[PDB]
Amino acid sequence: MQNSVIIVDKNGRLEYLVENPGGSVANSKAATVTGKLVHANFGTKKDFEDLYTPVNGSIVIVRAGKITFAEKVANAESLNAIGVLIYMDQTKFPIVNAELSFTGKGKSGIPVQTISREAAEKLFGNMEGDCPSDWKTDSTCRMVTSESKNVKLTVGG
Ligand code: NA
Ligand code: NA
């Protein structure tokens, strides 16, 4: 279903293909979105409450775990995020059979994509701000993209 995660420079001339994930998120809306990438830990409600950066109008990246993918997306949707990236921090191997179950059996309101940990680590290289020690995640974790960088998420259909 031809998915792609791309870091685009705000000068409009440079971009860097992070990953074209072979796996698709079942019931994700098919679209392309571009904006800031904000790390929201696991995407739980408390994670979003303790977040400094407003996710409204931004792509959020979350770790798999604690809650379903649908609940992560539903919280990001509620806070007016434009897209969601999901990755596992405990393995390099990609998420398989990623799935979104919503009331009414419909799709997400925003594009949702699973990415490998290597892909997440690449995004973190273009991101600033150490993640809180309380998250108990890899030292490569970063919070928000630098001002000169946006993430272009494309989920195909
Ligand atoms: Na940014
Ligand atoms: Na849940």
Distance between Cα 119 and ligand 2 center (Å):
25
Smallest-distance ligand from the CA of 65: 2
Distance between Cα 38 and ligand 1 center (Å):
8
Distance between Cα 12 and ligand 2 center (Å):
38
Smallest-distance ligand from the CA of 66: 2
Distance between Cα 71 and ligand 2 center (Å):
5
DSSP string for residues in 79-98: TT-SEEEEE-SS-SSPP-S-
DSSP string for residues in 107-155: --SS-EEE--HHHHHHHHHTEEEEPPGGG---TT-EEEE-TTEEEEEEE
Rounded Cα distance between 119 and 83, Å, is: 16
- Resolution of the deposited coordinates, in angstroms? 1.9
Smallest-distance ligand from the CA of 73: 2
CATH topology classification for 4-155: Glucose Oxidase; domain 1 (3.50.30)
Show me where the domains of the chain are located: 4-155
Per the entry, the structure determination technique was X-ray
- The encoded tokens of residue 19 equal 């990953």
CB 15 within 8 Å of CB 148:
no
